[model samples]
Target: KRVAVIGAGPSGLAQLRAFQSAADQGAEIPEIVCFEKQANWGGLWNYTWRTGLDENGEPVHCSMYRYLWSNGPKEGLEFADYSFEEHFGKQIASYPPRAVLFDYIEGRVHKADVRKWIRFNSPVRWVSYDAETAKFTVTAHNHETDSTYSAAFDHVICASGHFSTPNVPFYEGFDTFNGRIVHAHDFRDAREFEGKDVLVMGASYSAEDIGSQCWKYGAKSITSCYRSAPMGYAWPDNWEEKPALEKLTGKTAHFADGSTRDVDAIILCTGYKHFFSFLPDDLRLKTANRLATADLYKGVAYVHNPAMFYLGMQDQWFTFNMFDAQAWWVRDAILGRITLPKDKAAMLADVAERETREEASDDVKYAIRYQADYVKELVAETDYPSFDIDGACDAFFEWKKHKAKDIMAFRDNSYKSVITGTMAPVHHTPWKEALDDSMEAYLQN
Candidate 1:
C-alpha cells in the first residue's frame, strides 16, 4: 500500500517517525512518501528571511521570526520518546530560543532515519479523491525539476500546517498610513522597532510575545489593543493595553476607548487561519482553530472519507508530543491495527461528545488538562513511548502561574521534564538581559 503525507513540518515529520518506528519493529509499514514544500523539514521552526514567497514561488511555509524564544516552556512540548535531556546531552533550561528548539525537533527525525521517505522542494498543488478507484491523486510541483507530477495513494495525511497564511484585516485609512502596517507573519527583526512607539493588534499569544520581543529589543512603548478584554498581565511601565483600534489616521491610532497613540509601526498579531487550498472542499478541513475541530474523527481521520487524515490541526496546548500521539495512532489506523468504528455517523457522534466535553468548561486550566487527557487517550492506543502527560499539565499550569507572576521573567523559571522527571536548570542569562539568542550563548556557562 502507498501512503502520502503532505508537508514535513513537525506534524509531517511525526507521521514519518511514527511509521518508521513501526517498521523498526516487525510491522509491515506501507510505502510512504512525505512531500515537504521547503528545502528542509522542521516546518515553522525552519526560519526563513524571505517572507510572502520562497524561491519556489510557493507562499512561504514559515511564519516564525528570528530571535524567537519559546513563549512557553520546552518541557510542555518535549517528545515522549526523546526528552530534551536526551537531545541536548544534559539538563537545559525550560525555555529555549528558536534555534535550540529547532535543533531538538530535527534531532528526533534525523535519528529515526526517515529523511529517505521525504521529497523536499515539492509542494502539493492539488489533492483529489477518486471515488471510483478508492484512492487519492496527489499532484505536486517539484521546484528542482520544474515539473509537476501526480501520484495515487491508498491514504493521505494532511500535515500541512495552518499558520503560514496571514489573516490580514484591513483597518480604515490603512492605505494612506505613512508608517508601516505589518502582520506578525511578516514580522522579522524586532530591532527595526527600536526607540519607536509600536501598536500591536490582537491579544493572542502572537500579540503578547511579539510585543514582548519588541519591548525587549528596545521599542519605546507598546500599546496593544484587544477586542474583548486586556491580557491583564503586569506589564512594564512602557507597555500599555487598550481597547480595539477604531482606525488609523496616519501614524495616529484611534482606539475604541477614544484614546489615541502615535506609533511607528502597526503589527497585526491577529492569529492565523486554517487553510488547505490544495484540497477540494469535500477533502478540505474547514475547521476553526480550536480544540474541537469539526468533522475530524479522533482528531485525525476525516469522517466523510476515512482515507483522508489531518494531524496537528487543532488549537493546541500540546505541541510536538501531541502530534506524535496523533501520528502514531494514525499510523496504526492506516495499518489496520486500530479499527475505526462506523465511519460517518458513529464517529460524528463521538466527535460531538468530545466537543461537548471540551466546551463544558471555559477555564484555562480545565482546557489544559482536557488536552492532556486527549493526548493520553491517543497514546494508550499506540506503541509510542509513554510519558507523564499529567506532569506536563502541571508544567503548563506552572508556566501560567509564572506568567501571571511576571511575564518578562517567566522564562527564568524552570520545570521538570515529563519524560525524564529531571528539573531544568536556570537559563544562563535572564531572558530580559539575554539579548544574544544564539544557541552557543544560550548553552554557555
Candidate 2:
C-alpha cells in the first residue's frame, strides 16, 4: 500500500509522524510520499521575504509577515507528543515569534528522520480517484526539471491549508483608489504603513492583529471597520473602530455610519478561501469556514470516498495537536487498526448530525469545546498520547480574557502548558517595545 500526502505543512508533518510512530511500534507502514510545492517544509510557518510567485513560478505558501508573533498562546497549540519544553530545552514565552514556532515544528520531523519521504518543489497538479481500480492517480509538476509525472496511491491525504488564497472582496472605487490596497495574504511588514493613516477591513484575527501591529509600529492613526460589529477591544487613543466601509473615494474612506476618514493605505485584513483546484469538483470540499466542513465524515474522511482525507481544514481554534489527532485517526483507518463504517450512507448521516449541532451553537466557548470534543474522540481511538484537551480549551479561554483585558499586552501574559504542566515564562520586553522579532532577540534575557 502507498499513501500520498500533499503539502508538507504542520498537518502534513503530523500525518508523517503518525505513520512513523506506527512504523516504530513494529507495524508495517505503507510507502509514504509527501509532495511539497516549496523547496522546504513548515508550510505557512516558513517565512519568506518573497511574495507572489517564486523562482519555480508556484504560488508562495507563506502568509507570514516580518516581526509577527504568534497571535494565540503557544500552550493552546503545542504538540501532544513533543512539548515546547522538550523542543526548546526550557519553558519559553506563551506567544513565540513565527521563527521560534517554526523551529519547534521542524524539530520533531527532523528528529523522526522523515524528510527522506518528501519530494520538494513537486507541486501536485491534479488528483483523481478511480473507483474501479481502488487507487488515486496523482499528477505532480516537478519544478526542478520542469517535468510532470503521474503515480498511483491507495490513500491520499490533502493537508494543504486554507489560508493560502486571499478572499479579496471588491468595493466601489477600489481600482481608482490613490493608495495601495493589499490583502492580508500579501501583507509583509507593518513598517510599510509607518506614519500613515491606515484602514483595516474585517473584525477577525487578521484585522485586529494587523491593526494593532500597525499602531505599535508607528502608524499615524488606525481605523478598523467591521461588517457586523467592532472588535470592541480598548483600542489605543489613535485607533478607532467604525462600521463596515461603504466605499473608498480615493484616500477618503466612507463608512456605513456616515463617517469618513482620510486613509493613506488600506489593508484588507480579509480572510482566505479553501481552494484545492487540483481535485475534481466532486472531490473538492467546499463549505463555510466553520466548525464543520462539507462531505467529510468526522471532519477527516471524505464520505463519498474514504480513501481520501484532509487535515487542518477546519475553522481552527486548536492548531497543531488537533491535526495530530486527526492524522493519527486517519493513519489507523488506513493501517486497518481502526474500522470505519462500511456504508457511505451511514457516514453521511453522521456528518449531518454533527453539522446540525455545529449550526445550532454560535458561542465561541461552545465552538472551542466542540472541537475539543472532536479531538478527544480521535485521541481515544489511537496511540497518540493523550494530553488535556479540556485544559487547552481553558487556556484558550484565558488567552481570550487576557486579550480582552489589553489587546496590546496580551502576548506578555503567559499560560501553563497542558502538555508539560509548566508555566511559560514571561517575555523580557513587552510586545510593543520588542521590535526585533528575530529568534535571538526573542530569547534574549
Q: Residues 1-445, candidate 1, lDDT per residue (tens digit)?
A: 9999998999999999999989999889999999989999999999999988898788987888877998887889999888787888898998899999999889999999999999999999999998999999999999999999999999999999888888999989788888888999999999999999999999989998999999999999999999998999999999999998889887889989899988888999998999887989889888888888889999999988999999999998889999999999999999999999865789899789889999999999999988899899999998988788888899999999999999878889999987888889977788889999888888878
Instruction: Estimate TM-scores for all models.
Output: 0.99, 0.99
Tens digits of per-residue lDDT for model 2 on 118-219? 999999999999889999999999988999999999999999999988899999978999997998888998999999999999999999888988988899
- Model 2, 249: alpha-carbon shift in Å? 1.2
* Whole-model lDDT values for every prediction: 0.91, 0.91
- Lowest lDDT block of 10, candidate 1: 342-351
State the RMSD for candidate 2.
0.9
RMSD of every candidate to native, in Å, equals 0.9, 0.9
